[PDB]
Amino acid sequence: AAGIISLLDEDEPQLKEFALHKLNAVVNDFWAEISESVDKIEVLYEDEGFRSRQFAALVASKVFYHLGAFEESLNYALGAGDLFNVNDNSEYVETIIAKCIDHYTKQCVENADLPEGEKKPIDQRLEGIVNKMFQRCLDDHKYKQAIGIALETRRLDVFEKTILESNDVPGMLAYSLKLCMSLMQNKQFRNKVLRVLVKIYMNLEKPDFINVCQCLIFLDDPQAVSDILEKLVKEDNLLMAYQICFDLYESASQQFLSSVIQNLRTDQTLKMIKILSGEMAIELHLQFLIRNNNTDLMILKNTKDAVRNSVCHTATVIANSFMHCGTTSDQFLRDNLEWLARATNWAKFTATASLGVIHKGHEKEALQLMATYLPKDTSPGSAYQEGGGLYALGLIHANHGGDIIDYLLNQLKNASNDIVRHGGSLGLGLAAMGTARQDVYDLLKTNLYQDDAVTGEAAGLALGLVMLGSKNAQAIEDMVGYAQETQHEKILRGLAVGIALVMYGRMEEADALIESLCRDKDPILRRSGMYTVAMAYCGSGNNKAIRRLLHVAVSDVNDDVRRAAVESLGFILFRTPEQCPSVVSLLSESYNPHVRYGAAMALGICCAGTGNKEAINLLEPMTNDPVNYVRQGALIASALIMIQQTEITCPKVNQFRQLYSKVINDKHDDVMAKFGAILAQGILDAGGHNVTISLQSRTGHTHMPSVVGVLVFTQFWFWFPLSHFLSLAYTPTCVIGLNKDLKMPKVQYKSNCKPSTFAYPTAKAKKNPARVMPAQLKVLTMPETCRYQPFKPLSIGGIIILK
Amino acid sequence: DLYSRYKKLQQELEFLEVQEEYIKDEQKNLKK
């Protein structure tokens, strides 16, 4: 090879061309020669006189194959000048260009996250070759690959033009945004990509309202949904109009539905307002529920004869509440008037709250219905029932706005400050959840500032509830300041969850508040901070949140803080249940009983109702822990997990069922231990095997009511009356179908599967909505044999209208 | 759809490493 160096020592442009010929002819057959001549070639690198000056960079790139320095190849390509693009493919040129492309994508993301501009552009040839390879992909018609490069390129232009890869718009072109939702987290990038893709979609011939709802539900464009609804109204296709209305109503948060309704308001308009109005969907849902019930008295009798004459009275009443949640069938309790006549004046408050819960959704007649058991009518001397009446009234209109809010406001205004105001304020706050109205905020703050303990905790819970995810700095500063300012635990314990619920759904946005609460000395303030972390990062796998939470659980001495932390961990990872058991496994076996209890609760909440077949697997051994605390934790977790399941779907359901019975039958068991068993039974069979728990909407929008309910339940370890809040987290799996405004349809979908699961106390099925589960819903067959057919598929249940 | 496979693989990797560091810290603490 010595000729190479010897010739290079000579100075002549023709000599340079000869060096070019020989070296590009032999790149690796002789490598140390060029490896040492790197000096000569790099000094020639920068020389305008050199005719083949770009060929110096060409040499660098080509014959630094042994030199693994990536940046070396990067600069070699940058200076390559012309040959970089030409080298579409070869032995190793393809590798170096691919490496350059990935590095260019890295630089693009790095400088694009920089949002204020003044981003140092990369060498032009790099994006030139990037676009050339994009063109090669277009030729190969690999739409998925092209879009993946576009997003990793962090450039929405390529993302937009990728739709020209095949120009058919069957799927990905109009439906890969779902894949993007699944596998990305950058909210800033999220909004821009979402708006771009929805623009692409409505640019299509038919603006499919299903994909148009993305703006409203993910990008929160209430004005946009209002405008498209106005376009539909002037276009006179009421079918699609109320279809999208119901879709958003069941898959959207009221906070902006209010603005949508305002825009719509300022016939077809009246019908639109009604459907985007006080929950005629709820009315028909409750009609569906009463029309179909499967409840067993024998369970109530088995509880009754197993009466313990102890606290589990409250557990029994709440279990019966869960049994017929919203069924308005108290005869199971009306038959015997002693279960509610053998309790301390305090538990009876919970009993009347349960009575209210059983009666959920009537709204219109709720006034007179509650007056029927009115505190003055029932027991004027029992102010506990006085407060329970207002609590029940508030529970009835859960998230259901109306004059009940103002009525409860007035009642609280004219009433005792402490003895009764607890339940009344709590119910008023619940009924005005997220309404953000100042007329209720003022009353709540006054109540908080009435330096009272018995009712102040409920006042603070309501205060947090009303300002749901508002991020209103005024409220958060007020509440945090008042928290450290008082000298009561109950007040502070309530204010903890109140703060946590104040601001949420912001991922890593309220980190200042998170850190402030985390560093606070008070253990209960730390618990409040952990709950705030959970609620803010709800339904996401933010690694920072997981790391902070796990470190807290490992370190913090106060077992309560650790338990709250593990509960939060369960909360934030529900969208990916498969992974939750893996992390919870180690926690399952720890020295600290509280750690194990919180781990069990976290598993239960994370897996929700779907049975991973490993959650129960871990719970079973955990279902025999010596500590009673762990005993009820495991019972409740198993009950929550197994809800709605069947024997065939989960072989273990029988065991726990039987197990539950025995733990409510044996007498030697700890009373506090059994206190969870009755609630476990009630949850497992809650709502006549119709209601269901699910924090994610079928459209992917997270169910705020479910999250709030589960959080309050988790908080119910420090207070019993709070259990009723699980009523909010109950969405039955019934599939609702209606052709016209009220035209009930005679459709009977053929499940084309063995009933088995359906008949929970010949492949086919018939039915209006029925107790059909998401797993069975996905298998249902749409009966085209009838004249009218559904507008949208029946892949999954919900309210699918027909034509 | 190799893009999705790569994305989910990366998610699994990050989750695994965070779990690992947590376990290390927990064992360290339990020693005391």
Curated annotation (Swiss-Prot), chain A:
Modified residues (N6-acetyllysine): K667
Superkingdom classification of source: Eukaryota
One term under GO cellular component: proteasome accessory complex
Record organism: Homo sapiens (Human)
One GO process term, biological-process aspect: proteasome-mediated ubiquitin-dependent protein catabolic process
Full protein name: 26S proteasome non-ATPase regulatory subunit 1
One protein family per Pfam: RPN2_N
Subunit structure: Component of the 19S proteasome regulatory particle complex. The 26S proteasome consists of a 20S core particle (CP) and two 19S regulatory subunits (RP). The regulatory particle is made of a lid composed of 9 subunits, a base containing 6 ATPases and few additional components including PSMD1. Interacts with ADRM1. Interacts with ZFAND1.
A Gene Ontology molecular function term of the record: enzyme regulator activity
PC repeat spans: 350-383, 388-421, 423-457, 458-492, 494-527, 528-563, 564-596, 598-632, 633-673, 676-708
Similarity-based family: Belongs to the proteasome subunit S1 family.
Segment forming the signal sequence: none
Keywords: Acetylation, Phosphoprotein, Proteasome, Repeat
Function of the protein: Component of the 26S proteasome, a multiprotein complex involved in the ATP-dependent degradation of ubiquitinated proteins. This complex plays a key role in the maintenance of protein homeostasis by removing misfolded or damaged proteins, which could impair cellular functions, and by removing proteins whose functions are no longer required. Therefore, the proteasome participates in numerous cellular processes, including cell cycle progression, apoptosis, or DNA damage repair.
Swiss-Prot record, chain B:
Top-level taxon of the source organism: Eukaryota
Coiled-coil stretches noted in the UniProt entry, renumbered to this chain: none
UniProt-annotated location(s): Cytoplasm; Nucleus
Recorded family membership: Belongs to the AAA ATPase family.
Subunit organization: Component of the 19S proteasome regulatory particle complex. The 26S proteasome consists of a 20S core particle (CP) and two 19S regulatory subunits (RP). The regulatory particle is made of a lid composed of 9 subunits, a base containing 6 ATPases including PSMC4 and few additional components. Interacts with NR1I3. Interacts with PAAF1. Interacts with TRIM5. Interacts with ZFAND1.
Function: Component of the 26S proteasome, a multiprotein complex involved in the ATP-dependent degradation of ubiquitinated proteins. This complex plays a key role in the maintenance of protein homeostasis by removing misfolded or damaged proteins, which could impair cellular functions, and by removing proteins whose functions are no longer required. Therefore, the proteasome participates in numerous cellular processes, including cell cycle progression, apoptosis, or DNA damage repair.
Protein's name according to its UniProt entry: 26S proteasome regulatory subunit 6B
The organism of origin for this protein: Homo sapiens
Complete-protein stretch covered: 39 to 70 of 418
